Design a binder for this molecule. Structure first.
Ligand SMILES: CCCCCCCCCCCCCCCC(=O)O
Length: 288
C-alpha cells in the first residue's frame, strides 16, 4: 500500500508545505469580464487579483476543476506507484469540485480514490490535507484516515464577514439571506459555515464590533475542545486580519494553536472586498 494525499487549489496551503510534501493540486480558476482566465496558484499576487476585481465592471466568475483534471492527477499518482489517493475537496455546499473528484475517482482504473468533502474552504480545508498526510506517515490505512477526518469535521467550523454581500448573492453562495439584501445599513453581517453552506449568523452595528463578534463566537465554541487550532484568514484589508491575529495571540493561551492565512482568487471572487474569516479545528494540526 502506498497512499497519496491531494487537494484542490482552494485549500490555500503555503508553497512551503506543497513543496515539502509534494502535494498535488487540482486547480480552480477565475474568469474576468475581459475574458482573461486565471488558474489558481501561489505565484500570482493576490493583491493584483483584488486590483483587477475592483476595476471590473462585472464580478468575475469561478470554475471548479474539470472532471478531466481530477482524472489526470489520479492517473499521474497511480503511475508513480500510489495505490490509494485521499482527496480533500472544497465544500460540496458551495462547489461541484467534490462531486467531480468523487465521480473521477469512480472512472480512473488501477487506483483507489477516497474523496473527502471538507464542508469548508481555505486553510481550514487545508488542515484536513495536513492531518491526512500526518496519518499516512503514522501508518494509518485509508479508511482509518477518512474516519479520523470525519470526526475532525464534527469539531471544525468558521465565522466570517465581508464588506458587501453582493458578490456572495451574485454567485448564489450565501444561503438564506434574501432579507438583508440591498437594504441593510451601516450594519455589518456576520456569516458562518453550517453543514457546508454559508448562512447568516448575526447583524452587528459596526465592522469593529463584527470582528469582536467573530472572536467571541469562536472562543465560545473551542473552549470545550481538548485541542484547538485557530486560523485567521484575511482578505484584501491587511490590517483587519493582522489585528485579529495579534489579538488572538494575546487573548488565547499558548495551548491554542493560532495561525494566519489569506484567501486566494477563487474565494475572494465570491467574498468581494473586506473578507475576513476566523476558523477553528478541534485538533492540534501539524502546520510544519
Ligand atoms: C476561516 C475560514 C473562512 C472560509 C470562508 C470561505 C468563503 C467561500 C465563499 C464561496 C466560494 C465558492 C467557490 C466556488 C468555486 C466553483 O466551483 O466555481
Amino acid at each position: 500500500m502506498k497512499i497519496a494525499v491531494m487537494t484542490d487549489s482552494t485549500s490555500y496551503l503555503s508553497q512551503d508545505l506543497i513543496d515539502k510534501y509534494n502535494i498535488q493540486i487540482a486547480p480552480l480558476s477565475v474568469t474576468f469580464d475581459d475574458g482573461k482566465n486565471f488558474t489558481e496558484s501561489n505565484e500570482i499576487a493576490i493583491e493584483e487579483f483584488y486590483n483587477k476585481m475592483a476595476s471590473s465592471q462585472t464580478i468575475p466568475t469561478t470554475s471548479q476543476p474539470a472532471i478531466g483534471e481530477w482524472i489526470t492527477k489520479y492517473e499521474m499518482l497511480r503511475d508513480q506507484g500510489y495505490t490509494d489517493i485521499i482527496v480533500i475537496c472544497l465544500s460540496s455546499g458551495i462547489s461541484g469540485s467534490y462531486q467531480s473528484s468523487y465521480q473521477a475517482g469512480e472512472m480512473v482504473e488501477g487506483v483507489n480514490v477516497h474523496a473527502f468533502d471538507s464542508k469548508l474552504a481555505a486553510m481550514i480545508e487545508g488542515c484536513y490535507v495536513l492531518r491526512a498526510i500526518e496519518m499516512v506517515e503514522e501508518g494509518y490505512e485509508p479508511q482509518q484516515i477518512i474516519d479520523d477526518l470525519t470526526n475532525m469535521r464534527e469539531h471544525t467550523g468558521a465565522y466570517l464577514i465581508v464588506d458587501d454581500l453582493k458578490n456572495l448573492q451574485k454567485s448564489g453562495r450565501i444561503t438564506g439571506a434574501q432579507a438583508w439584501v440591498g437594504t441593510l445599513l451601516k450594519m455589518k453581517p456576520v456569516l458562518k459555515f453550517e453543514d457546508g453552506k454559508i448562512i447568516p449568523e448575526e447583524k452587528v452595528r459596526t465592522k469593529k464590533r463584527a470582528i469582536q463578534t467573530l472572536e467571541k463566537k469562536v472562543l465560545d465554541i473551542v473552549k470545550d475542545f481538548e485541542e484547538v487550532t485557530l486560523f485567521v484568514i484575511n482578505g484584501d484589508h491587511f490590517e483587519d486580519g493582522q489585528a485579529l491575529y495579534k489579538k488572538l495571540q494575546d487573548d488565547c493561551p499558548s495551548a491554542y494553536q493560532v495561525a494566519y492565512s489569506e484567501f486566494g482568487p477563487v474565494v475572494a471572487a465570491h467574498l468581494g472586498s473586506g473578507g475576513l474569516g476566523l476558523g477553528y479545528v478541534g485538533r492540534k494540526i501539524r502546520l510544519t
